[PDB]
Design a protein around this nucleic acid. Structure first.
Lengths: 121, 247, 247, 121
RNA sequence: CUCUGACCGAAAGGCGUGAUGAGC
RNA sequence: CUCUGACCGAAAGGCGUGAUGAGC
């Protein structure tokens, strides 16, 4: 797991991330793609950001963890960029995605942040 | 890693622009002044290093001769000129003391030219430690302007591609952001050859292609020191032909 | 006579001011840049010639010690305190390649100070062959700015005193002339010591007196070469102390 | 006669000059003194300029003759700078005068300039 | 395209070869 | 305080690692 993956995400949590993104798409507002995500973070408009762990080069998303710890926004890893891409409703892949407003998914968001607060500490 | 070398490249590239500002200013002065003694050389040597090298190594009109002009290495029609313009000139006479001080000015500007090449090579070699990929895509000089405008490698490596496409366009961007006027399609990256020499109707698309690649190139230089610029330089060639193909 | 020597003098005084600009510009860069390596030296050495002289001959922090700082000729408080701030500084580390390029910048700023002195010597000596009366009255430098502002010795020799009094206030003058705003009392002649430092309430009348004498000195310099400056200065000294008198 | 006196002025012409100045003062307009006179010539407001011939240093009025040739204004010499000054209505002397508007003197002005037109050529 | 123009000083005197007024 | 954000292409294909639109 590449150095930019700073903690080990349990196979389950990952799966709850992908369907938080999924429902937050339809019932809410998300930003797909690394440049929009980063833009959403610097504006404190990110509720959560998901970051694939298969990105090649791995440095394309390497600024997202540090930038997220400065704005305090919770972040999590999913194993596949193609999966993340589809979960976000696009035919191609996505190296990262940020949920702006969770919509009918906020429940999942909160608990992702809770379980993640732990894997950090 | 050290980690201050990116701030040093910044000073150097700002210094390189200052040296350029002063070289112009002093060369404009060199020409006004030496033109009092030799009006006609002004137009005849429109190229600065050539004018300076002349005033510095030739000086007074009484030293111009077929010999010294060839050793100065300028063409055959040129040197057939300057020899008519010279003996027949309308410029005022200059004593030894009068021409010595203007030649001092031209020995100075020369030092300045050698200082400029020193800065130009220092950036070039420094870029190789600081941001090898950034250097490969756009060249060392331009890569240093980017780092400079961003405020450093880290700052530049934290940026979205949309910011990078407009670095250097700061006023036009703000003015677009405040009033709502049409945005700049490019900042400093406008010098990238494939932009400024391409059909005007494709410039925004090449800008946005290049910004894309520079953002990735800057993240790699900063976070790893891994070297990806060959593929990055190809994916970008492809995307630029693919862009040219249709238009 | 020749008669282009006044034009070269003009060029040289303008040259002096141009050279001043680039020194101020390169020095600033030199300070911002060497501050990455040694932040504190900046406030310690507010005097540019001293700061540049330091960087040039000392360079990297490692080379300082008690020894080299006296041969630099700085006072005893200044030395121990800079010597202290070093061993203790928060500055970034420099390589030998990194410090060498900023030492080259310093080396060039030094060449420039010498150029500046050369020009200032030229003007001073040439001013004796061009307008000795003007030199005697106002100094070599100030007389050159006057010639310079007027466009030449002949152009100066033609002006009413009232124009001479305001040379170098052009903005203020043209403002007044259009909108009837209150006129400047002085241009460049403000430099003249008796004006620049006097009760603000007698500055206007002194300017008026000095300009009158400057007009006469300029006509003599141009149309004769006769030397009246001694009478002129004394008759001016007279009129100033007389002004000084009643106020 | 100092070098700046470019031609010889008949003891007569001089005498009309001074009285052209005198009636131009009462019935017309004049500018007394070298600075004001110079100002007048550059503004082409001068019908005639009288230059005294005793000026010390003589170079003080030495810019008038060429400056007058350039604006094509007629100029005449009178013998005394003190006389010139009383002619213009001042207690002190005057190294030059210019007539702005000749007033009741236009006749005199005209004939000074005709008799002048020769001495030059 | 480049200020004003005969007053100033208690007087002695200064002053168109420039008094006075005036935003380098 | 630092653009836009899913389309483009006749298709083959390209495209969130940025399509499109846009005032160095």
């Amino acid at each position: 797991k590449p150095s930019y993956v700073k903690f080990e995400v349990p196979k389950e949590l990952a799966e709850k991330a992908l369907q938080a993104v999924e429902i937050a798409r339809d019932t809410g507002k998300i930003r797909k793609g690394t440049n929009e995500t980063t833009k959403a973070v610097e504006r404190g408009q990110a509720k959560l950001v998901i970051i694939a762990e298969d990105v090649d080069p791995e440095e394309i998303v390497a600024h997202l963890p540090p930038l997220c710890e400065e704005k305090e926004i919770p972040y999590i890893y999913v194993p596949s960029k193609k999966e993340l891409g589809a979960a976000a409703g696009i035919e191609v892949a996505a190296a990262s995605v940020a949920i702006i407003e969770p919509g009918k998914a906020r429940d999942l968001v909160e608990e992702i942040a809770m379980k993640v607060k732990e894997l950090m500490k | 890693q050290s980690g201050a070398r990116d701030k040093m490249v910044i000073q150097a590239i700002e210094a390189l622009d200052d040296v350029d500002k002063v070289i112009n200013l002093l060369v404009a002065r060199l020409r006004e002044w030496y033109s009092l003694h030799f009006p006609e050389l002004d137009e005849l040597l429109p190229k600065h290093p050539q004018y300076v090298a002349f005033v510095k190594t030739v000086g007074h009109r009484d030293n111009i001769n077929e010999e010294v002009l060839r050793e100065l290495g300028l063409s055959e029609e040129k040197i057939k000129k300057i020899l008519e313009a010279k003996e027949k000139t309308m410029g005022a006479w200059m004593d030894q003391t009068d021409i010595e001080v203007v030649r001092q000015l031209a020995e100075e500007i020369d030092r300045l030219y050698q200082l400029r090449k020193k800065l130009e090579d220092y950036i070039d070699r420094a870029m190789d430690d600081v941001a090898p990929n950034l250097k490969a895509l756009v060249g060392a000089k331009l890569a240093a302007r980017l780092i400079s405008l961003a405020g450093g490698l880290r700052e530049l490596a934290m940026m979205p591609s949309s910011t990078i496409q407009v670095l250097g366009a700061e006023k036009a961007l703000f003015r677009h952001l405040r009033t709502g006027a049409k945005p700049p399609k490019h900042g400093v990256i406008y010098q990238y050859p494939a932009i400024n020499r391409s059909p005007w109707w494709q410039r925004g698309k090449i800008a946005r292609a290049l910004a894309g690649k520079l953002a990735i190139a800057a993240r790699v230089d900063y976070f790893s020191g891994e070297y990806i610029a060959e593929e990055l330089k190809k994916e970008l060639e492809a995307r630029i032909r693919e862009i040219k193909e249709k238009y």
